[PDB]
């Protein structure tokens, strides 16, 4: 038994790579070999060893002739570029035994395309005709790629999501890249080329592990021809692979609603407990029958509920959920998702407001109405998914998802008078939706700066019973919970004192006060000027401290507060507080070696205008070597350029 530790169940590329390895090993001589998940890895049972497997792939492995005239992938297309032609010519000018299938397939597809007699490209009806001809002229080893990439249908074509627009993205195809990688030996992987989700420091010329890509495309072929329509209702309607439903952003976290709304599809990949041979996997991945029962599982939540019911059969231990998300652009990425569960939740109480006047029920009751096309039913399904996700995970982006689906529903209903008649006027909801919903004002930036501390300890350990190890759970004990109520300055002062005490007891000389969702000089000025809303800042900070912090929300900022109303005393005192690392980076004359804030300074600041004068005298004396709001402002995290600006002044 071989452990393919280069493969973990994620990303989707790795799962497909495992399937491709198993498929190739089985098909080519080792038919009854078996392949199952274990140890965060794929397991293979075969009479190949590691060395036999490597020799197989290096010296004998015939790749599947992935060539697609149904898109720009046969090697013969009007719109294209030179490298692809050079590649295809080199492959056609082969006579190697390993390349024979590619030559035959390319010749056949060229002949079919010529038989189309095109100007530049064929149309949808012509696409179906071309697919039929290719099916009638290809051979056994090619047809799995045809079945995976494209469909033959009664009324209109539709493109399976796993391979984009039919093995194609935009106006170009995966087959040319596949060929180029082979000779060296779009939508492919977020682990290599994902949207901004992790710490920075990477660059490449659109590079990918070539074996990963090849084996991924090889494994994608196990998704078979039984991707039929849901014979439901009475007009042309849903087509999909097995295990396919649209995605919901429960547990997504490092994802934005601008990508959820256009999400192409969601696919649930089974994981299983014992070695499984290829034909059983073909049955499993061909049927994947989660499509039934008149209120169809259009989206992921119904799939999850079926899993909970064991409606998705046992033997499959788990499903790895993947969402094809549009990364605010022209491309879709197969984003993996981590797992959360239905349980008690304070933000879930928000949903009760939607139950006022029974609105939600009425809306749901209206959704089936077929005079509203499948769109209304799909929106109702999406709303149910978003609400269940809100119950599962208390996160501002889930609240935003619910609000966005509600807005889309409202727009759709506004376009339909008959539907407008069927639901009574909406009940009043409470302001807590908004406060949990998106915020990004000066209040929000100050709150996120205060909440987004990253010296190990999150701000939660002060505002709530929290510990850094479990940031969205009933966590272990980090005992700094000294927060309070009402106006924000006193509670921030208490947090500063407790952080200084914790630093002294840990003996952290550099105060743990660095934050990485910072405010700005304008936000700090608005706070200091006496005009910003303190209470909303406090509530937003408490909310933001609740969970594992996401990559970042869509930031949409606002202008600074300044009209001859921004003091210098803040600049005089700030260098005494800033994390020493940062300060040392900062020009300030003050020492570099780290420091627990000069002993008496916070108390003097809290002692009022006379106390502020004493604090200024003390700061002057140390640098040679009104209060409360000023202290709270001094706590706010901001970046080094502001400190440089201060020093210049």
Author numbering: 9 to 193, 227 to 666, 682 to 705
Publication passage describing the model:
The unique Csb2 subunit processes pre-crRNA, remaining bound to the 3′ end of the mature crRNA, and seven Cas7 subunits form the backbone of the effector. Cas3 associates stably with the effector complex via the Cas8g subunit and is important for target DNA recognition. Structural analysis by cryo-Electron Microscopy reveals a strikingly curved backbone conformation with Cas8g spanning the belly of the structure.
The large subunit of type I-G systems has no detectable sequence identity to any other Cas8 protein. Thus, structure predictions suggest that Cas8g is a highly divergent member of the Cas8 family with a C-terminal Cas11-like domain. Using multibody reconstruction in RELION 4 incorporating intrinsic motion we were able to improve the overall quality of the density to ∼8 Å resolution. The enhanced map enabled us to model the Cas8g subunit using the AF2 predicted structure as starting model. We separated the N- and C-terminal into separate rigid bodies and using DockEM we modelled the overall structure of the bound Cas8g protein. The N-terminal domain of Cas8g sits a considerable distance from the 5′ end of the crRNA, and this together with the lack of a Cas5 subunit represents a significant point of divergence from the other structures.
